[PDB]
């Protein structure tokens, strides 16, 4: 399996941004989403399509439809500037596949 | 790439336990380790062989040797009872490979 996402997007403070991932695995398997900030370990912000791990703000939401999955940030904050990666189970047992990441810039 | 780990081990409160993963990827790429508790998202306890994410207790440590990687918990506490999964970059671009997991039972 393979996944594709746009390499970069911006959002203004307080606006909404949607980051989408596409690939065949997404018809079968739920997407998860990682946030990567400089000097930190990656953080799961969404898993199993739309569930938020403990402590993740509700301004992060996930959805899917068909061969696409999306991460939406509603009311973007300065701290949300990060690289975001979609992932899912891969066709190979015990493997996961990732998108190439989307760099989010938050302006204002 | 593929990774193997023993399915189960135990540790007494206050003792040390080492969970080991084996596979060819580990000679060249660093392992990460996830803790999985029921009803929660997976939590990265070690990444990039030996680094601990923010907030993870220093009783968790990681190492590697040859085609193996190890998670050691020194001074196990009751809350450490969980499933632990090793992972690494896979031979396929943008893929990760995982072991099958090790169920850790903490006794006492
Ligand atoms: Cl500790
Ligand atoms: Na997390
Ligand atoms: Na984490
Ligand atoms: Na127990
Ligand atoms: Zn694949
Ligand atoms: Zn391809
Ligand atoms: Zn297709
Ligand atoms: Zn900036
Ligand atoms: Zn593989
Ligand atoms: Zn095989
Ligand atoms: Zn400590």
Assess contact for A71 and A82: CB atoms under 8 A. no
Expressed in Å, this structure's resolution amounts to 1.4
Q: Which of A64, A62, A71, A77 is nearest to A11 (CA)?
A: A77
Ligand nearest the Cα atom of residue B47: 3
Bridge partners (DSSP) of residue A60 are A73
Inter-residue contact A83 to A5 (CB < 8 Å): no
CA distance A34 to A75: 19
The experimental method is: X-ray
Q: How far apart are CA B108 and CA B25, in angstroms?
A: 36
Assign B16 to helix, strand or coil: strand
What is the C-alpha to C-alpha distance for residues B33 and B26, in angstroms, rounded to an integer? 13
Considering CB atoms only, which of B44, B51, B97 is closest to A95? B97
Element housing B70 (H / E): strand B68-74
Query: Helices H, strands E: what count in chain B?
Result: 0, 10
Buried b (16+ CB within 10 A) or exposed e, B3-13: bebeeeeebee
Domain interval for residue B57: 1-108
Query: A93: Cβ–Cβ under 8 A, 6 or more apart, which residues?
Result: none
Chain A residues with at least one Cβ partner in B under 8 Å: 2-3, 40-42, 44, 47, 51, 53-54, 90, 92, 94-100
| CATH number assigned to the domain comprising residue B84 | 2.60.40.10
Number of domains composing chain B: 1
Q: Which residue has the tokens 């990039």?
A: B48
Contact A97, A1 (CB under 8 A): yes
What one-character DSSP code corresponds to residue A51?
Answer: B
User: Which residues have beta carbons under 5 A from ligand 3 (an ion)?
Assistant: B 44, 53
């Amino acid at each position: 399996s393979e996944l594709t996402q746009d390499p970069a997007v911006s959002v203004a403070l307080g606006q909404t941004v949607r980051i989408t991932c596409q690939g065949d695995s997404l018809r079968s398997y739920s997407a998860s989403w990682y946030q990567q900030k400089p000097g930190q370990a990656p953080v799961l912000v969404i898993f199993r399509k739309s569930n938020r791990p403990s402590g993740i703000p509700d301004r992060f939401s996930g959805s899917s439809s068909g061969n696409t999955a999306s991460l939406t940030i509603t009311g973007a904050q300065a701290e949300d500037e990060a690289d975001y990666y979609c992932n899912s189970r891969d066709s190979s047992a015990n493997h996961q596949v990732f998108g190439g990441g989307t760099k989010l810039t938050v302006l204002g």
